[PDB]
Amino acid sequence: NLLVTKRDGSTERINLDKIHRVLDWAAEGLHNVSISQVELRSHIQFYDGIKTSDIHETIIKAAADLISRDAPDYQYLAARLAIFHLRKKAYGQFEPPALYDHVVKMVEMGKYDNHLLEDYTEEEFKQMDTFIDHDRDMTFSYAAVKQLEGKYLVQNRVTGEIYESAQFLYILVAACLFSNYPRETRLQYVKRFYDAVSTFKISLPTPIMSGVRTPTRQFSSCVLIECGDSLDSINATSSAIVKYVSQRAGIGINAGRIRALGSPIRGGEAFHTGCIPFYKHFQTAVKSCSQGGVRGGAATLFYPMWHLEVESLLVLKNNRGVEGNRVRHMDYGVQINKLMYTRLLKGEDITLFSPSDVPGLYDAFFADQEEFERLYTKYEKDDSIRKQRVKAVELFSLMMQERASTGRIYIQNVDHCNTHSPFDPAIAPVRQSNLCLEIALPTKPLNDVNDENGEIALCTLSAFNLGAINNLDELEELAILAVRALDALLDYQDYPIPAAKRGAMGRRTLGIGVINFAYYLAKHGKRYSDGSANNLTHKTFEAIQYYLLKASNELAKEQGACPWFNETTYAKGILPIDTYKKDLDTIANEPLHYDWEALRESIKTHGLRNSTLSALMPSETSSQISNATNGIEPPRGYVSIKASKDGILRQVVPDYEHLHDAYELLWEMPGNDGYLQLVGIMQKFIDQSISANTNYDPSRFPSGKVPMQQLLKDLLTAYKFGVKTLYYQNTRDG
Amino acid sequence: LPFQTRSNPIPWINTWLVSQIDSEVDTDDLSNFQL
Ligand SMILES: Nc1ncnc2c1ncn2[C@H]1C[C@H](O)[C@@H](COP(=O)(O)OP(=O)(O)OP(=O)(O)O)O1
Ligand SMILES: Nc1ncnc2c1ncn2[C@H]1C[C@H](O)[C@@H](COP(=O)(O)OP(=O)(O)O)O1
Ligand SMILES: Nc1ccn([C@@H]2O[C@H](COP(=O)(O)OP(=O)(O)O)[C@@H](O)[C@H]2O)c(=O)n1
Ligand SMILES: [Mg+2]
Ligand SMILES: [Mg+2]
């Protein structure tokens, strides 16, 4: 009596058995799910001419909202319905076509890069189709599929039309990355790299997932730009931000060199308006474009704690005040060194300077800690230098007060970033970080958009799934595949800013981290807070760094070390196991298990293909593909609520049925000392930095308010164990 | 039991069949800390 509208446009009589059958298929083998419950909770209202695709999307939401602790298998029921929906959207049927036939149609539409048809023959495409196992789409969770359809699968950002499925995405990321490999070993690397990412051994970042196979080649997640104290440099910095934001990149800006408000210009011809008008310019640059059409542009801005405007810069994110003195849509990282912390411990003062009035103080602040103390104490005595005194306690209180309110005021320990880094501070110091405070790479400011002398640092990412390995020696093979893939990516992609290509080709910096670390600890019966995972973390992250360096070392024998390898501490025969902060020996006594001395000699002889290798990113989005716990963070709950384009997503911890007692949830931790100790142990081996979080529950403190004493003690504890950076400060909402 | 064990296929039927910051700092406590 009533009519529905099929996907092809035709109409036919309503038949509820069709809905029953598709749900019966999705619930096969699942436990504690109910086809009946999904249909009734859909509240689906039939009208004459109702689109069959609107019907299906409605029951996907209904099944997705039933994901709970008592019925976790709904994470697979909703995913199978969503995978089924995505197949019809892209192919008009469930069974995907042949790999070659798909690539041909997509290159003509301009959705793929035409180089795929030039570097691979039809006989090779048909040979890669035997590698593909399309049944692996039936292993995703619902959150994973929603990230695919929302961000990663090639799609029209105006139409909403999906063009591909999950396995074609994986196989073509492998094809593109090894497309320039010799045909003696190319298809072997393509198969192994496809197996690695489609069975969740390796995690790939958002720009690689959403980009590698498309005509526009920019796949580095992090872009670090240093700004000099000139209008030529501010214009160059701004232009680089706009270009890289529009091509899938997140920005880290170093604007600490810009002189303070009221400083003379040309001897007094003009009055300097201050940093804030230039910060506002950087903010509109970041917000001017979307991040490759996938998400919005974000940036973190860095300045030293002793900057003359620091009290005005620390309060840029709070929502009180006028718009003239507020820059709310960017995050900030305050740069601190040992001298600053010492003034806090001794209850003395901190002198604020404009970087234009203190010769050599800014450069020494990163490269030479003794020269900094010499220049700093000298300039405090000089009464002819414009300065401002603040009690170190009050300045640290202002910073942590704004850090706790917004959660987006970050800390970078610049001395740790240079005493325990792969770079020589005299040649290539580290003066900033990135958006999420895990990247620490050298930069030099630009004087023009096309300045060949400036250096912009790019970093390409990936992650090891700690929940997918059964033996630490499995990392040896995975490190080879990951390093070879990311190194071939640097030559494969394009570079919109010449200064950015300089750093990438010169240093070839990689940032490979981990995911599922919390699930990893649960399988070993360890916890974050009690320190029971200290020795396990040491043994785990020793293997990660060792097999990473070994993989990049073997690649250096094959294709030559990176051009600027001579600027690394690796070239001088210095390993991370030499420059780590010695207080870590008081929280972990696990001995080194791998032959670091043989590698040290091999690195002296053959070098490294990449200047950096390891960095622990948060992987907020990419870790959801493998349904892993993101990065090193403990999950907020057994069923976590995460954000998405369509709305809320429920994500169940892996192996919930057998390990719900083994997990230690985020707010089940007494404090941060145990977590920060693990971060310090990881930092012993990590080349760059870690997106370390601090978490605070107000209800765990007397009178329900978090003491500044604890905020500062955890901050000092992080420095005590060599933690380079501090990312989010999560405060509980209850 | 004559049939295979199974969970309730219509769980909805059970409904019908029953019934900020503490600003205090102690510098002395902080100096007893070794960096
Ligand atoms: N008209 C202006 N208003 C506010 N700030 C300015 C102005 N001109 C320059 N600045 C700021 C931006 C830089 O941080 C700093 C130096 O600018 P720059 O482009 O180097 O000028 P300049 O080379 O002509 O003068 P200077 O000799 O002071 O460097 O002063
Ligand atoms: N005649 C009909 N009446 C009501 N629902 C229908 C129907 N035919 C299919 N459906 C439902 C079942 C699926 O959950 C959803 C989409 O199914 P589909 O197989 O992709 O659509 P189609 O059969 O139009 O190609 O619509
Ligand atoms: N919303 C975001 C998230 C990440 N990123 C970039 O991705 C890097 C690592 O973030 P991540 O690993 O959590 O992001 P995904 O790779 O999971 O998307 C950051 O350093 C940013 O440069 C971004 O630009 N915008
Ligand atoms: Mg159908
Ligand atoms: Mg000038």
XYZ file of C-alpha atoms in Angstrom, chain A residues 30-34 70-74, chain B residues 7-8 11:
13
model
C 27.476 -11.678 18.045
C 26.554 -12.103 21.707
C 23.810 -10.346 23.670
C 22.465 -8.318 20.730
C 18.839 -7.970 19.646
C 26.497 -5.126 28.896
C 26.270 -5.432 25.086
C 29.672 -4.517 23.626
C 29.197 -6.611 20.465
C 26.988 -3.822 19.096
C 20.249 -14.198 25.687
C 16.894 -12.408 25.850
C 15.097 -7.123 26.161
